[PDB]
Design a protein around this ligand. Sequence first.
Ligand SMILES: [Fe+3]
Ligand SMILES: [Fe+3]
Lengths: 125, 125, 762, 762, 155
Amino acid sequence: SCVRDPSNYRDRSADWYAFYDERRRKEIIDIIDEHPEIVEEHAANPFGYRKHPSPYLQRVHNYFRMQPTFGRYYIYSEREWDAYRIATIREFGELPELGDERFKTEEEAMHAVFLRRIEDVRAEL
Amino acid sequence: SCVRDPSNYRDRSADWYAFYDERRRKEIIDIIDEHPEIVEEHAANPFGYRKHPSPYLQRVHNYFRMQPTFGRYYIYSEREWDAYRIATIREFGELPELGDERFKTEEEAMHAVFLRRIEDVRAEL
Amino acid sequence: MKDIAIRGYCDRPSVATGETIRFYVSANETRGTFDAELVRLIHGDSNPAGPGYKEEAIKSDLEGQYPARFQRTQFGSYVEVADPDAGLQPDGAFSVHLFLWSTTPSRGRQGIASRWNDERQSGWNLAIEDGRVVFTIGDGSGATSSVVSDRPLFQQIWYSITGVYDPEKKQLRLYQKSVVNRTNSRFGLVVPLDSDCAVSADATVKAADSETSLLIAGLGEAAAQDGRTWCIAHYNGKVDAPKIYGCALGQDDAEKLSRGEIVRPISRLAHWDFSAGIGLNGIPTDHVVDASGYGHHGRCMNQPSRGSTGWNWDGHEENFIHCPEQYGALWFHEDCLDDCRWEKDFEFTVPEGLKSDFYAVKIRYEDTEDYIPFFVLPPRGTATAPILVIASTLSYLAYANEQIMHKADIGQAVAGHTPVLNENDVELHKNLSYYGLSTYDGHIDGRGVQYTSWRRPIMNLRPKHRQGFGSIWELPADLHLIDWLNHNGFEYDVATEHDLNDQGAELLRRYKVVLTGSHPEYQTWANADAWEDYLADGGRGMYLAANGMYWIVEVHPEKPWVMEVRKELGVTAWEAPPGEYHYSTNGRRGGRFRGRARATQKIWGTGMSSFGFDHSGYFVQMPDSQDERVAWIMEGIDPEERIGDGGLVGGGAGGYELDRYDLALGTPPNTLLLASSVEHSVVYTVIPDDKAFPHPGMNGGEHPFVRADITYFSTANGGGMFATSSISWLGSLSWNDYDNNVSKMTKNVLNQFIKDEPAPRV
Amino acid sequence: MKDIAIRGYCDRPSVATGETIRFYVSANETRGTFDAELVRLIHGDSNPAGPGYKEEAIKSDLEGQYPARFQRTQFGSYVEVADPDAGLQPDGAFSVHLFLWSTTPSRGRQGIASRWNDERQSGWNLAIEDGRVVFTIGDGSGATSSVVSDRPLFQQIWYSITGVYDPEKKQLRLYQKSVVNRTNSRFGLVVPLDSDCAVSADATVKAADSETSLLIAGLGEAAAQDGRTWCIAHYNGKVDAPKIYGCALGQDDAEKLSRGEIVRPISRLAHWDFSAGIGLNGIPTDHVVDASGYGHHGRCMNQPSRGSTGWNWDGHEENFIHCPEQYGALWFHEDCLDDCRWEKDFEFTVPEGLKSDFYAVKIRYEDTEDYIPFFVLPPRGTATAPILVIASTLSYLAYANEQIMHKADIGQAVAGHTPVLNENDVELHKNLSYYGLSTYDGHIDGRGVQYTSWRRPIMNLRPKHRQGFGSIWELPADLHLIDWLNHNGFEYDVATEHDLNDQGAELLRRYKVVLTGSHPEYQTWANADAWEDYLADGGRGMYLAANGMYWIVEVHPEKPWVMEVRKELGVTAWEAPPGEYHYSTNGRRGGRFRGRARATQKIWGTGMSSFGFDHSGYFVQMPDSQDERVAWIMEGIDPEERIGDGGLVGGGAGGYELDRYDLALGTPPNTLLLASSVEHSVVYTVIPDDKAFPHPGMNGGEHPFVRADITYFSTANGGGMFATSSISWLGSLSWNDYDNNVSKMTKNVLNQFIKDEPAPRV
Amino acid sequence: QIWYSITGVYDPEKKQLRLYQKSVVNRTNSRFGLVVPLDSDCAVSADATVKAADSETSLLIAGLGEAAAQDGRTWCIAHYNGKVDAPKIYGCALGQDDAEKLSRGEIVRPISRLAHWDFSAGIGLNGIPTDHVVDASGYGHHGRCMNQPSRGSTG
Ligand SMILES: [Fe+3]
Ligand SMILES: [Fe+3]
């Protein structure tokens, strides 16, 4: 037994993080398949203002909101209260990848981000 | 302005704790009215063994499990794996108030406690 | 219902060959006799799905009949000053000054400081009656003279109190002044508090000799019998710098005393400085120094909290070893207990040939059956087996007489089901004075219990006890391992965490392999050092548990049967109040092992990640299970099987509490991850140690941190460490009549570790 | 997309009449000119539902055109030793010894210690290349001689490093030894680590004069111009006790050096002891002492972490003021910044008559518009209004250039929606070197940022900025109050938390009433003392915010523009590593105000209870609202109305962060509870400070602690304190064209507090 | 004037009396220093033919009880000259390894102590102005200094 070269070792918990993530994706797709109404719910009131999200919608949100920042979507305000676009976080010293479509309101942009994330999870599976 | 007599003051947050608690009770009764299946779910598997509780059932559990110990129900084992009764927590130096009915299994006792708590919340309202 | 008739304890947890252990027994009434015999514990769990209860009767001189008698227990902490010559009972004018900080001012009559006989109503006392400070004298005829304050005490506010007897003016006087600062009291200087008073009353009697010892935080019940003064009317809160003067003090003297000046030093009869004895190693003593130089030294009783923040604590220094002048207070609770102080009923000397194992004294009285467990060590300086089992006696003391489900509002919420309690829990609730509290309970004041004792009847220590979290806990759970070993014909020795604390790495170095308990949660700094040194030099260890080495504990140097722990934010029942984090026993910052850069990962490979008690999950095999280097661990297990689906603890191997792999917390770089536990519900939670900002869904099945990791690594000179990272693991050993993956894996690891070959390199 | 062309800052936050403020401006390239003018900020929020953006142009000498130029910023912390006479460039045999603790060993080329010219490749350097320690010399001809270690460094492991140049043997030698103990490294003594080596190489060149200053944790870019050495190849991690010897050291010398012995003391050329200067008041200086007695003193640059745990830290003492010999390390990060050190572009002297308010310098360059905000104080020692507004400049520094949504994984989870970011956030992400990090961000190493500076362009300080949590934050949010005051014709003065820190209770005592900001989260001990003293003696205060007085901060005695904070378990972005909790600026235990027995309840009546940023709720009136004693507060409000349903911050008065009534944490006994906020979703969470054991459902609508409490109490001499306990409160003042319950209640309280009458008794 | 660690053991199971003696000389504590090749260590055994009866006297440090205590006074004879440091009694029979650990200042088998007198217990900023000797085993067998022995003496 001897530990000499740091290159002979790695973060083995990564093996769990893969195994976990796959299962979670399979779970999320099941929820959206068994509770299709939640999508329409999110379209009506993305903030949950005076109408709090459904537990199943909250479960989908709980999965989506805690993802790694690198490659994660956010909303870029091109013009205040006029134009919003979907941006992707990249490495430090890189500009974000902006979407082609413009959105009149931030709520519309949030719902578009939600739909795009569901489509990405479907594409991976 | 003078603060001299401790008897002229009280924990005024009690006024909130009443106002809160009433609202919560009205909420719980609504859930059990709008999701009657959860009761039957709890009868099938109170531990959630390989079948995790529904979010609405979990909400009812979340309300019931965090109540003050004084007056709260637990299960007394009269005979190991043979007889269980429903007991009420009282002041230090008092014996608990035991129920008249006996239960063969701890799961049956837990479901009986659940039903009794729902009946108590109904009685108060 | 069925009620407890007999209870008992022993002086020490462990005993070696030719050493003596003493037993103390109390009945409800003095009536008849009881039968005592010796048994060896094998299996405690009485679950029909399992092997069931198992013990072996052992012939000894201990076996026979003994008279059954009631033995009174002194309950609550105080200070006792023995005064045989009635020096602290003056014949003329006298005064008493102290600083007080009351936690339950309206909780009946509470004696602050007294030389008082309550049976005869003789001597002098300063007490709290109807939430007011009262100074009383009595001549023993039943007639008493009292002076009562007109300003009732505010809860957790520092006060300067002076009581004066003036025979020349034939008067009793009382002076009360609030001494609130920015950091010492419940509320600050913004509150326009008016609690100052100077009151006078007529003195019609003279203070007679009480024939009792002087008490701080109590009153004498009656005249001392065989030189013992029973303490009643217990006080709750802090007392700082009590003193007696042989003259009558005025208003100006009281004013100077309230600011911390020592007025008329020559006139003092006694002055107790509770801070006297604080050094770099803290204050590990019960000795209270008389600072007036008249040798009226005191003794702490039932372990009051030493190194407590005082009346003048401004919060510039938060370690009592660096600012002793601001840490002159003692905290008294009415429900403290460090020793039952009963009379011995019988003793046992360990004969030659009695094999090292778990033992108990079985007592039958009326229809009641009680057990007094203990541990037999091998002959001093020798080993009698290649396997050592470490009993978690520190963890047993931490959970001793636990009453979570009767006291804690969130007990059932944490449990994740309605708790199931037995006659032991009802007995604890009914008669608290006989048993005392756990470190998981708070005092009647609200502050968490910091000290736990072995010298008391501990009901949850008996093999037949079932715990509130839905199955067996601590010692009974450890028997799951013992039975398994006895079933597989393995030869092992037994040692306690106290024995490891005493003997260090030398105890561990006598064995090929060392096995931990079901829950080695509470450890000393020395225990961690011993484990590290043992594993580093080629020792082999099996961590068949979770949440090990979480809390730092210290054993009291003067009282080896007393254990101290001070808890902070994390997986805790309570938080230490500001400036009281350092241990009085050694003067060091304790609490979480992780907070002191010694997380469990650094020694055993995995560390605490989650807890939940609704049920248990099962393990799924990870890629490293297929590695050629660990083919020996997974031998006879099909690579597509679940590991521990079914058990006596939540019906699975992965549950109750979980540990995880983490390089950042000090997991060895060469450690392999063999399997991870799944099927954890919302009841399983992310621990506060792993949270920056709490957000929704930080719980089982919604966060990556909620899991258990089966791990192995190798060290120098053919040493190795294997971890299962689950409390419920030992619960799954006997499942399906000892035919399961958990049993197979444990047997493979233990068979490899007891060979003369070096542990396999990874 | 739209990109930033111009940026700038000022030397100091606040300025009084006849005092000077300097401005520093940088463009992307040196070309053309920019326009500068003076404006008074009124309303920052551009929400169509609200009043919209409002400013007033002010005539000044500042107005005009200035040339636009690029100004380079030195980024990353290091130590600089000025050596004009090349004393630390020996002509013969020499050696360099140090202790290293690397956090990013594989992150490119990192200079450990050097007197090196990288342009000419002249002098000597010890660096990390391809994760290996390399010792290099160069003669300036481009030819260099190097010796490379054969053992790559492990992450966060303490190493003893010796580099030797021996011209007699024509050799370069390198000695590397692991010095791991129980508590100082990532992993413990159980790991069989083999990272020791002794390597030799041929020296073909001689070390020439680099014409640069000696650097710790960096390399010299080129020959010093105007006596400035630019530092490149920044090192990440700790350096402890670096020293240079004027002789060639052997293996035995390296072995003795690795154990902490000072070998051949006479032969030392320099020896920097980073612990030299630690006292009872910590180490508030950038001066590094040369312990060899040759006066080669150093200077800390960009504020490296002082009072850091060293190579020999055994964890027996966790305060650096009591064990300085174990705290001899400095922590360097490649992304530290305490001062941009730019050239002044123009200055402004405050004329007589300019009213105390929020001001900004407005700059136009190309199509880009930038703001440099600052505050005008009244003439020194006088007040010009009965109302004082305290700008939360400490909180502004805490959130300065915050990048939560780009760095923190749980940023969106805490926010409770997809964040909305503008060109300022993109600019921060693109060019980090220009701006630096917030106290809510971690360094590239992982350790949280402890130091924040005013002397840098702060993008989230400008009035038009919108923050990631879904609305405006800090200074713009404070403008919600300012506009409201200006709308109601109230006369007020403006002061900063820095000014309060300097002036104490004397500043507050000049006004009838003092108004806090939207979020006074970060305060000094002196600020809490000043507030307590002001309110105690008849001062009147309005706490129109939540989460006030949560974190203890200290202002750097030598650099008033630098702020320190060290965070712990609670409502935190990060936790301080073991043994590094005490502040280098004053040597005191900081972190949470609550942890030091000074919870916000003790001073302002309510304390932090919950946070959540999905939206805001509304207040429901409690019984005490109907009390005759507070009829003045609720005048013109129907007793069956909701208070603040609608607003510019989450559409409600009760939201974002909440405070609650609590007697146990020091709420005055006479305090009344007028209203409580409702309609909080699962996003709102119970804070870790209020949890013993986390259990399911500790969140909004499922736990009693998730609420805001509107409270009032009265003090001595006609003083009073009113609290709304919500960040979003000021967001609801202008709702429905200034016609709402929130505006009415605030106006009633402010009208009562500015009268000559004592505040009403409760 | 040489510092010694002394252990006396009564073992009825082996029917034995044992004595362990070890010199604990350092640079500054003894008459002569570490240069002297001192050989004063020993481990000796003898047969125990009688049992220890109750003396009906108080325990003495630096003396022997003359006779049975009359009116609760024990007369002290055969007076010792020199220093005693950390005397303790154990309720078990100690071995060679226990004696070796005791000679280095380690408190072995703490639970097994019957009494342990720490003469330094009570030293503060004002010295030790008392005759009270603290029992550090937590069994309340406190002692009393008689005829003022020199306190605050080098150990
Ligand atoms: Fe525990
Ligand atoms: Fe904050």
